[PDB]
Symmetry: D2
Subunit: 249 residues, 4 copies
């Protein structure tokens, strides 16, 4: 029968492309969302039109809190509930915004940026492993972590922690046959609130084609890592950045 | 005027070694502690008998919470209260224990391991910089972050986030003339509860001398980074590991 | 028209598996070899029986010398002579043997280890680019490059230069639409001369499955990197090591 | 008696500052050079004026060839002949020029860039070790993962040097020989480069919008050879003003 995958923040943009490609590959999917209910259900409707009862949605805030472990457990449980199995976890949901060192309170920013990018991946990783073939986890990382955007220290700390989790969980879960890997975009789908001139500044920086990655190109790397063609691969983070991280200042 | 330094978790072990060496170099010191009140007071007494009014203690829990920003702000405030300046911050205090993926609640484990190793350094860094010559911050990292101990994922995530901080904060605070660097021990002071046979198993693995780093050897690298001999150094992490991280399985 | 690929050191082992999978994928192939003449011709025979006129052999020594540039030129030329095009270069051929610091002269050891692992890849890369779809190069690197085997300094130097080449050529050849990537094995096909107790000692070290990578599992990663599913990927090295590089001493 | 150090390419620029600082720390020095005889001799005279019989020059081409192993052995031998001991080796000499992928022949560019940056350090390390606070410091490059366009052989040479630093650290540790690296970002700029282009680069550096002095590079070499770094091996210290942290 068909394997099942959980994709966090799967309603729009990159998580959406990932869930679509996984479904096209033959997976049943849990579309996790926080604020984007309409979009999440729209995607489920589309996927279920293709193959009946192969997509469900699951709401959760992934901000760090007292209830986050229970929320993460429920995300995994919804996959087992809907499909009787959970073969793939994709940690894609992510808050992204500046937190200058020199109005959300700083402790809220910690909760959101560190929660979404690191603690929730950790808790979902725990629950995914506890509840257990070709099982794997794919973490959406960031190819630019060592050359970070100015004033994004919390966001960067979140993504660095996710690298640590990817590595630690690969080592620890290997005995269980659970592989744990990452995909590290450089520039992909650009901010909605970014202006067109600024977009082109960034595009011009990419050696391979002077363009951002499509969400589908990011999804392609996820598809590889979950597949039978990556069965010896664990603890690896694959850059999908058109060479951007190689470009000096 | 003598410069002043804050060392977190400075009552014993490596934090103490760093405070002492800074003091011997001519720094006035804030000895931060959490539980080790007797040892912190004792160390301060010792340093003050060497030079009068050159050391004060400062108690704070560095577990993550909504009050952690205020606590970190107060730690920096206490350096200015005592000495009228704050030249150096050393982020040494650190929780370290296993958190298996498959007692304390996971919420507490997250708060302690991520708070001490990452969030408190980030908040102390904000406060140190907000309050502002040879200014710098040294973060105590871990040379083994890419070959972590089994079942230490939250601890590892915390140390990886600290690397991210070191880099982000080096970039962002360079315009202010604040350098931000790391020292990464491999095996130094062994756990107090560890049996001699287990200690020797680890000692035997170290290429350079088959022994752990002394606390002073760790302090030596910290003292270099804060000195005028490191005035162009920022965003660097110096391994003090005797070659351990180079040794394959 | 079918695309064409050069695989160096393709007569046996991992190189052979790569040549076989490329061919199965629809590529015409140049089977480069040095001494394994019989095995190279035998492979070409096998592949040509499957689809006629889709495989040729090409002999060359890839040791560093003044004629190495011309030899590398001729390898690329042989691909054009046979197939009219050259879409993919796989830098697989590699000398591997200890060279302690404390019958071959050191001059020969340098020429062999640095020539095969670094200079030949570099010269092949020049020639490939100069003769110029989905064009790409895949370099066979080494996951253990930062945790090297004792007394393998020249080999390790070679593999390190190979990473540098992958990055530098990714950046420079991007404007030409040539992607440059790496696949980094941990332990795969074991040395011929190695005895069985020693083989099993190394197998025990691999977290994922306690065994070495098949040559086909290595080839699988090469296949991905050259595919249309990796079209935004350049300057990336994918570890295929079962988590081995994550294991501390 | 005083310890002794060999510094390669020590006649000028960064290697010169390294030799001067080592000398000021109390080392006797072998000032190796290739083409800069007048500058090397001028340095030796300055140092010997300071302390009699504490500096000698040693000429050698560090390009890769059949004779390079013998030349490197002779450089180490020179330190023993002058001073009776060799405590420190600094691998500083380096060829640096573009080699685009698309009058020197490429085999000569390989020989010069790979020989000076990698093979010569390896042979020198062998010779240094066969003869034995002992340490080796290799001059690396902080920008090796964000390389300059069309510098592939140079970049290959420096990556090879990181491999050597790690491999030799591991292998010579049982002998009490530590092996480390100093990785400048931008330090002393080419003499020929117009100020307009120098300042373009200077402005990229987060920490003070300037290049490293040769003396600041030397300071990190001085730390690594000192008693203060006695547990440090296989480490490479960036001295780059934050440059490698700056995205495109
Ligand atoms: N886009 C890029 O150029 C780029 C570059 C580097 C790395 N990446 C990584 O790739 C991944 C996807 O990128 P993206 O641009 O598609 O992401 P995105 O648009 O910024 O966000 C993806 C989703 O994250 C979910 N999310 C945010 N905060 C949440 C919270 N507190 N709780 C639960 N869910 C939350 C949101 O779901 P709802 O809409 O349902 O609220 C959002 O739609 C991220 O991990 C990102 O860091 C992207
Ligand atoms: N020891 C090693 O071999 C080694 C290896 C790698 C890295 N390191 C790094 O080097 C640094 C020092 O090592 P160490 O072994 O000396 O450290 P440690 O003894 O394990 O901890 C140092 C201090 O951290 C403080 N701390 C713990 N939890 C705290 C909390 N919730 N709030 C405030 N303070 C808290 C404690 O202060 P109180 O005693 O006052 O409660 C403790 O004395 C650490 O950052 C460590 O990660 C050490
Ligand atoms: N566990 C592993 O096997 C492992 C681990 C890490 C990395 N890797 C990397 O993966 C690749 C394949 O591994 P492998 O074990 O299959 O390699 P290998 O069998 O040791 O060597 C591959 C071929 O390289 C060719 N070669 C050697 N010296 C040459 C020279 N001077 N000139 C021209 N060709 C020469 C030989 O060709 P002829 O037989 O025709 O003479 C040989 O068959 C290598 O790059 C290796 O470094 C392998
Ligand atoms: N300058 C920078 O911004 C920078 C940046 C990153 C890394 N670094 C590293 O720091 C080190 C010092 O840099 P630098 O700018 O001072 O170096 P440099 O001036 O470019 O070269 C130093 C010396 O290397 C010697 N050399 C060149 N080719 C040689 C050969 N074939 N055989 C023997 N010696 C040869 C030359 O000696 P003669 O003059 O006697 O012929 C030259 O003076 C180098 O390893 C370099 O890669 C420097
Ligand atoms: C030029 C440029 C391209 C893409 C983004 C960008 C947009 C959204 C976004 N979301 C996120 N959770 N994480 C990111 N790293 C991210 C990055 C920003 C700037
Ligand atoms: C063999 C061995 C050597 C040293 C430690 C060790 C002891 C205490 C300790 N505290 C800490 N905050 N962080 C560490 N990384 C740490 C590590 C553990 C095991
Ligand atoms: C345990 C163990 C597994 C595999 C090899 C091994 C065998 C052949 C081999 N060839 C080569 N060109 N490069 C390597 N790194 C290599 C490695 C050595 C030791
Ligand atoms: C802008 C700019 C910055 C630094 C150099 C520079 C000058 C000389 C130089 N020599 C050398 N052996 N290695 C280098 N990496 C180097 C670099 C050149 C141009």
């Amino acid at each position: 029968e068909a394997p099942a995958a959980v994709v966090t923040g799967a309603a729009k943009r990159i998580g959406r492309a990932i869930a679509v490609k996984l479904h096209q590959t033959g997976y049943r999917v849990v579309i996790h969302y926080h604020n984007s209910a309409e979009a999440a259900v729209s995607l489920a409707d589309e996927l279920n039109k293709e193959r009946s009862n192969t997509a469900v949605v699951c709401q959760a805030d992934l901000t760090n809190s007292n209830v986050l472990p229970a929320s993460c457990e429920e995300i995994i449980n919804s996959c087992f509930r809907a499909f009787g199995r959970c073969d793939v976890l994709v940690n894609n949901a992510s808050a992204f915004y500046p937190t200058p060192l020199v109005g959300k309170t700083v402790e809220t920013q910690v909760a959101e940026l560190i929660g979404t990018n690191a603690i929730a991946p950790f808790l979902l990783t725990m629950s995914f492993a506890q509840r257990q073939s070709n099982l794997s986890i794919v973490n959406l990382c960031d190819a630019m972590v060592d050359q970070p955007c100015m004033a994004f220290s919390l966001y960067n700390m979140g993504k660095h922690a996710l690298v640590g989790l990817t590595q630690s969980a690969a080592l620890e879960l290997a005995p269980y046959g659970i592989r744990v890997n990452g995909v590290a975009p450089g520039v992909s789908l650009l901010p909605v609130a970014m202006g067109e001139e600024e977009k082109d500044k960034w595009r011009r920086k990419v050696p391979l084609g002077r363009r951002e990655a499509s969400a589908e190109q990011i999804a392609d790397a996820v598809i590889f890592l979950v597949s039978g063609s990556a069965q010896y691969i664990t603890g690896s983070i694959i850059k999908v950045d058109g060479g951007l991280s190689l470009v000096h200042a």
